[PDB]
Design a protein around this ligand. Structure first.
Ligand SMILES: [Ca+2]
Ligand SMILES: [Ca+2]
Ligand SMILES: [Ca+2]
Ligand SMILES: [Ca+2]
Length: 316
C-alpha cells in the first residue's frame, strides 16, 4: 500500500520487545519499505487461503498475543534480508530485491512453516510440538533460504538433491541466527519446538544422530518417506558443514575448522555458481571444493578442510 514509513513497537512470540518497520495509511500496516521492494506480513486468520490480508493495526503497537507471530515473521525477515545483503551482496531472494511476503496464523494447530513458491507461511503450532514457528530466527531464515535456492541452484526437493536443499536452508538459517547473535547455536528450531521440554530441537547440525538423523553416508535413508528422506539425509551435509566451520574428529577423521564466515562464503558460492537442480552429494563435494579453491586457492587450509569434512561423512 501507498503510505508513509513509520516505526511501530511490539512483542514477539518469546515475549521480547522489538521495533518494526510499518507503513501508515489510515491503519498501520506490517509493510517495511526500508528493505528492497518491501517486506509484507499478512494475517491468514487460521485459514489456508493465502496470502490472507495485509496486517493492519490501529495504533502501531503490537503487544497482543495475536500479534506476536506477525511481529517476529516481519522482523526476522528483515534480519534475513540484511544478512544476505550485507554478507553476500545479494538483494532479496531473487537478487533483484523481490518483495518478501509472509503469512502467519496459517490453519489451526499447524506444526510447520514453509515456502510455497511465492511466500513464506507459518503455522501457530499446537502449543505441544510447537509454538508459532516464526518465533525462531533459524526457522524464518531456513524458509527464506528455500526461496534463494529456488531462484539459484534450483535443487529438486527429492532424494539427494532435496537433502542438499534442506541442509542449505539449515546452514544459512543457522548462519543468520549467529548473525543476529542472540542465543546462537548449531541446533534447528529450539526456540519454538516443544515448549514443555528444554534443551531439545527439531534437528542438530553438530550431532544429527541425537534425533536419529544420519551423520555418515553409510547411514543414509533410501526409502520413500519424506520425499526420499530430505529432512533426514540433510544431517549428513549438516554435519559436514558443522565440521568445516567448527572442526572435530568424526569416525576417526580429523577436520581443521575454518569458521562460520568462510563456511558461509564457500556454500554461498557453491549454491549460486556450481550446484544444479539434480546435484547429488558427491557433486556438492566437488562444488564446495571448487568454491573454496576459487576463494582461497587450491593449496589453502580452506580447501583441505572441505575435503576432510566430506571425507569424515563418507562423501567422495
Ligand atoms: Ca495495536
Ligand atoms: Ca538459539
Ligand atoms: Ca538454532
Ligand atoms: Ca523444547
Amino acid at each position: 500500500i501507498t503510505g508513509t514509513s513509520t516505526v511501530g513497537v511490539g512483542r514477539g512470540v518469546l515475549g521480547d520487545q522489538k521495533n518494526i518497520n510499518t507503513t501508515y495509511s489510515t491503519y498501520y500496516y506490517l509493510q517495511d519499505n526500508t528493505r528492497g521492494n518491501g517486506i509484507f506480513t499478512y494475517d491468514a486468520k487460521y485459514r489456508t487461503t493465502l496470502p490472507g490480508s495485509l496486517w493492519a493495526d490501529a495504533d502501531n503497537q503490537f503487544f497482543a498475543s495475536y500479534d506476536a507471530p506477525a511481529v517476529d515473521a516481519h522482523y526476522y525477515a528483515g534480519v534475513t534480508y540484511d544478512y544476505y545483503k550485507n554478507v553476500h551482496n545479494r538483494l532479496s531472494y531473487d537478487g533483484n530485491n523481490a518483495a518478501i511476503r509472509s503469512s502467519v496464523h496459517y490453519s489451526q494447530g499447524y506444526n510447520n512453516a514453509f515456502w510455497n513458491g511465492s511466500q513464506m507461511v507459518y503455522g501457530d503450532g499446537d502449543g505441544q510440538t510447537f509454538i508459532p514457528l516464526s518465533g525462531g530466527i533459524d526457522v524464518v531464515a531456513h524458509e527464506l533460504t528455500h526461496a534463494v535456492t529456488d531462484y539459484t541452484a534450483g535443487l529438486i526437493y527429492q532424494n539427494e538433491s532435496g537433502a542438499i536443499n534442506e541442509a542449505i536452508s539449515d546452514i544459512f538459517g543457522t548462519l543468520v541466527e549467529f548473525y543476529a547473535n542472540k542465543n546462537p547455536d548449531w541446533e534447528i528450531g529450539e526456540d519454538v519446538y516443544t515448549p514443555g521440554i528444554s534443551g531439545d530441537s527439531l534437528r542438530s547440525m553438530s550431532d544429527p544422530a541425537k534425533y536419529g538423523d544420519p551423520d555418515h553416508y553409510s547411514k543414509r535413508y533410501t526409502g520413500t518417506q519424506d520425499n526420499g528422506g530430505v529432512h533426514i539425509n540433510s544431517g549428513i551435509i549438516n554435519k559436514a558443514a558443522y565440521l568445516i566451520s567448527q572442526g572435530g574428529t568424526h569416525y576417526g577423521v580429523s577436520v581443521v575448522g575454518i569458521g562460520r564466515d568462510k563456511l558461509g562464503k564457500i556454500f554461498y558460492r557453491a549454491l549460486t555458481q556450481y550446484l544444479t537442480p539434480t546435484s547429488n552429494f558427491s557433486q556438492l563435494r566437488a562444488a564446495a571444493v571448487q568454491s573454496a579453491t576459487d576463494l582461497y586457492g587450491s593449496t589453502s587450509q580452506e580447501v583441505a578442510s572441505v575435503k576432510q569434512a566430506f571425507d569424515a561423512v563418507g562423501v567422495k
